[PDB]
Nucleic acid binder design. Structure first.
Ligand code: MN
Ligand code: MN
Ligand code: MN
Ligand code: MN
Ligand code: MN
Ligand code: MN
Lengths: 241, 235
DNA sequence: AAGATATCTT
DNA sequence: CAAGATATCT
């Protein structure tokens, strides 16, 4: 499938290459900084041609948002089925020590999830799948000078334990918010193999959704409705009260 | 000065070089995506070597934060007087007049040590390196094809200016409460034709700006109403 | 104006 | 954790 091949290929590409800098037309290279955003940006640019290569080997077109603040990074679809779109987002986190537990921010829970068309490239109901390509690395100077193409193997790299997975968003979604004032779904908090294997907390994609479409924006209010999965099934069990 | 040399070095670098992709140690290059999370990341790293070089030429230690949501990008300071620190932040925006976002108005400026590398009272200057550009491929390239790689921008312009001089009176962001710069012409930022009469005024004004339009309306919404408020005894 | 896009600190 | 920081756009 498109899926087994995308992960095999991102997987393979990660094993074979190491981004070490950004380069200019003239050939001068500038090392990578350490802070998180440099790396999310980079893993994302890293994924892009791979995603496109596999997509067209299977015949799907790939459309990135033509506008900012719009989900998802990549919209895949066969013209044959415009209502079977596939959303692919990139999510990244770090580790201070290899193989420790991790969590990601999975996107807003108050735009397209509640409003079919807010901040999303196509209406929400035209997608049948929402995948997350997740990157995990261990955060790790000669990083402040520039280099030339002949010194590529000695440029210091801001990280080292890079791992990559591809999994359905509802599947690794957790029950606590991933951020506050920017209202993001939080993923589970767990080791890398738990993301690869699907050991999430929802029973289904409808439960993930119903949960996030009714979770209050603050602890205040979550006091009265529900604040985690157990309470939320108690509230459902009672009649949504 | 440290200032005029950094300014001249950044103009020069900007002029001579065009960032066009990220490169791997095996020699494979990935082109640049379009959204902004990308350009700000790239200009910031593009700025790194120049800042550490001009700083060293002047006797300053350069320092970045460990914790990632901590201002400023660069803290410059001579070892001998750790108490006169210089803050350098990078801010970017696109052109099709421009406005930038300039950082929070509720963290360190109101409470001396929040989200900041060194207590706010230890910095005696806050500079903004501003990058503006005009907003214009899914395969990979090799070192020989550098000039074939599409660039998501055209015509970058860089300026260096004190954060207070270019600060405006309208929030530059809502839920992330950012100070907004003036909304003007690039020349204006270079020439420093701001609206505050002093940095004392810019800081008192953002230290006391309210979060929502509602509350702001009972206090002030712009520099005019703020100068009225001062006249009423801050009430 | 307010709240989206990503993820980290406290 | 929950809340609010990092940048900057609609
Ligand atoms: Mn994207
Ligand atoms: Mn994304
Ligand atoms: Mn829209
Ligand atoms: Mn930085
Ligand atoms: Mn900054
Ligand atoms: Mn701190």
């Amino acid at each position: 499938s498109l899926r087994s091949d995308l992960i095999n290929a991102l997987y393979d590409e990660n094993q074979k290459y190491d981004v070490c800098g950004i380069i200019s037309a003239e050939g001068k290279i500038y090392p990578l900084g350490s802070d998180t955003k440099v790396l999310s940006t980079i893993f994302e640019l890293f994924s892009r041609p791979i995603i496109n290569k596999i997509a067209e080997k299977h015949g799907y077109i790939v459309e990135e948002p033509k506008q900012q603040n719009h989900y998802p990074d990549f919209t895949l679809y066969k013209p044959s089925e415009p209502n079977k779109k596939i959303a692919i987002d990139i999510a990244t986190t770090y580790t201070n020590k290899e193989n420790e537990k991790i969590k990601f921010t999975l996107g807003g829970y108050t735009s397209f999830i509640r409003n079919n068309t807010k901040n999303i490239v196509y209406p929400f109901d035209q997608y049948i799948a929402h995948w997350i390509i997740g990157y995990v690395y261990t955060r790790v100077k000669s990083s402040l000078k520039t280099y030339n193409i002949n010194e590529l193997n000695e440029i210091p790299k801001p990280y080292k334990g890079v791992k990559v997975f591809l999994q359905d968003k509802w599947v690794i979604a957790g029950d606590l918010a991933g951020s506050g004032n920017t209202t993001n779904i939080g993923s589970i908090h767990a080791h890398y193999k738990d993301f690869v294997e699907g050991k999430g907390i929802f029973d289904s994609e409808d439960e993930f959704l119903d949960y996030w479409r009714n979770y209050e924006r603050t602890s205040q209010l979550r006091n009265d409705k529900y604040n985690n999965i157990s309470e939320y099934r108690n509230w459902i069990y009672r009649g949504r009260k």
